[PDB]
Design a protein around this ligand. Structure first.
Ligand SMILES: CCCCCCCCO[C@@H]1O[C@H](CO)[C@@H](O)[C@H](O)[C@H]1O
Ligand SMILES: CCCCCCCCO[C@@H]1O[C@H](CO)[C@@H](O)[C@H](O)[C@H]1O
Ligand SMILES: CCCCCCCCO[C@@H]1O[C@H](CO)[C@@H](O)[C@H](O)[C@H]1O
Lengths: 343, 343, 343
């Protein structure tokens, strides 16, 4: 909620409490999943053209006991925006791949999981320098593009080290570049995004699958957002980029997400979806294996802009086999029941 | 403080800094105890009858160095409330036992410690689904009741596991049900609350005292709140529910708290109290032993709605013996000196 | 930003996102250094004379992955202030030494590092009871003084223990007293501050350098703040107080900081600085060694009260030798590039 607006600066303090509960035969995905998010979006007017901004967003689990409570920063960046020239921001933010893949990431709780956080330039991560452009310098109504750089986030100790080092190799990344082009026009949307990033020595020399000099992704996306209907689909091909449970990464992966939603006037919003992640030439005798594969069904009911409830049902199509057990990937169904307050 | 109220939704952002210091011969209870709380209470009007809400509250210790700072979510829930039918909320909240036992939990710093947090349904804990009713469907002015369910919060690894697992057995709980009835009338208050919950395999199979299939509690409470006077008392009998230091739980426990307070017009509010927790048939050669026993004396001075100071003096009546030393229970006195700002 | 002000109480909710990046040949000081601060300053009017207040400030790193995010309380105190008599506050706060040494701590990112946090009474730390006086009881315009007490912050286990114990000996302290006198007059500033504090048994009996019964400091400071110019300098002599990397403390240390800044009307603010910390009679064959020594150059550009960017360049004059390598002190240069949003 916009709690402050005076003399050029305005601040939006926003958050939600998500009363959430998972039902699953997988005990590790069964139980209380309640959490809270808090954040601010700031905006200051510098000149006629220039404006400065800063966003921060934070998650604090609400399903843990008081002796040990986990929380983390989702985004934290600051930037400048100049009318018809572009914007620049730096900090923890979403990678440019997400500019397109986010069109399918629209379900209440599940979905958007053919990629993780801190997964190179595919979603949220540290050290993003991002240039964005709206309506191609104000000339083409609806044509947006972005060029982004991510600086190396290395290990905590030894060489290949950075000030913000991290022992988990799945959260590390070398220097990377990516970009995206988006075009919307009266309901329709065509999108593309490419990214390439050096992989660190640690994530290429600890006996994991899917090693190589670079982690790369290629994304294309379609959508339709009008007349109470939402349809979307994204296709992304990755190399040494998609995480394969605990085993490592997939040398090659073909990701597909599709979503269909409808919005009734009285507040109900059913949805149907299908996600899939096919790994190819994984090595170590695995060959071609589904990393992710599930239908997702359910509905959200909006009481209000501030209150909603939902049922989100993940029908897991993965088979329980030696590959999935070695990686520790969930093959069981999950039902998420939500009750959410926002402001 | 209510920092936002517009078009049906209103938000109260509240908090306090409690400048606090303990004086004690027990070194582990002697020193700086300064802390901070922050929270929001949200309320959105859906219809004439229906309203949606969400509360979050957080504690962050202010007595630690910057290298290592502990903090935790006290509550985090979201709910709906329908006039003259009831309310429903889910998330981290207070158990229904507290509906009555909270009448004695009214001292500045000590008190309210014949039970812990994450102690089955006795106080704050994860995964509470709570139904509450005000004035018995609007028919009986002052008759409130509540029915509550808590879902299993298991271990972090192995079986008996949940998505929000926790290695500390004292914070675990199986599926539980409880309830409470409250009646207030022109200053007086009669209350009752029962709760029963399955205990987990981990908390019944790690060689601790007070094991059994179920942890159970039975509570009755009296009070008087008028003419600048506050009196209250609660009696709760527990089985396999009251924690006994580190040794385990008490197979049977009889808890009693009594409080007397008076409020002077100029801001001073003296108080006298007595808490006691008698364990019975504890096993392992212990027999009947006081788990908790102390008089509590002192006073708060209110400068304002936003500023207060207090002296809270815990006279520990427990004897230092092999039982208390084995459990690690404090037998020494503590004096808490407070200086508090609120908003 | 002042987000609340009603019926005597007013609350300022303030924060910043600092998009920050270090460039260094030292890998441990090279990379993303992005962070966020959040805080509130509260003020309640009790009477004509008396006012109650409370400040809290918090840092949350923005350069870490979601699996592991570090954050900490910088300050957390509550106090009363009586017109022309003085103020009193308790909690986590700045020590009185900082009343003078803070005049040089005015650079964007570096500087203010001839002392650490939780470093006895030299900067921020737990358990400060501080009395302050403005304009010497309202008699002398510009003469301020302060008397401060810090209570022992001991170890986590054993004896020499406190309720807020801490295993890191560099964060521990015994009972201490200090004070400061400040005089400002039409742009000029003369300041002095002394502090003495018992050192704990743990920090005198773990085989570190710079042991002794007491950690002591003696500070003098000059400054000039007017006509778009800022000049400042502080000299502090310490005994058993200045931390020497990992090796321990310096038995004797002579600290000097000097700063020169200029503020252009169009927003640019160049600065030049020099910090130095000379250790004397360090023991263990080290003799006299520079603990800290660097020139600091750069500039901040203010777009606005809410938005700024800066280059902060630390020219490290320390030589790489066996002393600095044993202590783990950085001898390499660092360049910090900042983009900041505030509110
Ligand atoms: C507002 C500040 C903008 C800073 C943009 C970041 C510039 C990228 O800086 C990069 O950081 C990497 C470590 O993360 C180093 O390995 C690279 O050498 C360096 O070029
Ligand atoms: C808004 C969402 C409401 C969800 C109410 C919680 C329903 C209780 O769900 C319970 O959770 C337990 C694990 O915690 C499981 O062991 C039980 O089988 C399950 O019934
Ligand atoms: C608002 C509350 C004000 C309390 C002021 C703190 C009083 C100092 O209390 C000191 O604490 C030390 C441990 O930290 C003990 O070792 C000392 O014996 C004790 O005097």
């Amino acid at each position: 909620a916009e709690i402050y607006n005076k003399d050029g600066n305005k601040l939006d303090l926003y958050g939600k409490v998500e009363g959430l509960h998972y039902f699953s035969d997988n005990d590790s995905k069964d139980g209380d999943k309640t959490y809270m998010r808090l954040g601010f979006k700031g905006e200051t007017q510098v000149t006629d053209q220039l404006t400065g901004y800063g966003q921060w967003e934070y998650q604090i689990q609400g399903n843990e006991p008081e002796s040990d409570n986990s929380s983390w920063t989702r985004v934290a960046f600051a930037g400048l925006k100049f009318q018809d020239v572009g914007s620049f921001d730096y900090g923890r933010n979403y990678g440019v791949v997400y500019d397109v893949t986010s069109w399918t990431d629209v379900l209440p709780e599940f979905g958007g999981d053919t990629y993780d956080s801190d997964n190179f330039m595919q979603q949220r991560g540290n050290g993003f320098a991002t240039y964005r452009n709206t309506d191609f310098f104000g000339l083409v109504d609806g044509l947006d593009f972005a060029v982004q750089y991510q600086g190396k986030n290395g290990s905590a100790h030894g060489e290949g080290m950075t000030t913000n080092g991290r022992d988990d190799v799945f959260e590390q990344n070398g220097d990377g570049v990516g970009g995206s082009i988006t075009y919307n026009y009266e309901g329709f949307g065509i999108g593309a995004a490419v990214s390439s990033s050096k992989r660190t020595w640690d994530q290429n020399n600890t006996g994991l699958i899917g090693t190589g000099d670079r982690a790369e992704t290629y994304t294309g996306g379609l959508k339709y957002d009008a007349n109470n209907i939402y349809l979307a689909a994204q296709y992304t091909q990755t190399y040494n980029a998609t995480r394969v449970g605990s085993l490592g990464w997939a040398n090659k992966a073909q990701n597909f997400e599709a979503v269909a939603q409808y919005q009734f006037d009285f507040g109900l919003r059913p949805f149907l979806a299908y996600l899939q992640s096919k790994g190819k030439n994984l090595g170590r005798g695995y060959d071609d294996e589904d990393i992710l594969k599930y239908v997702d069904v359910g509905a959200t009911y909006y009481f209000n802009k501030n209150m909603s409830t939902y049922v989100d049902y993940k029908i897991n199509l993965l088979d329980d086999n030696r590959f999935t057990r070695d990686a520790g990937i969930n093959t069981d169904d999950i039902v998420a029941l939500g009750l959410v307050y926002q402001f």
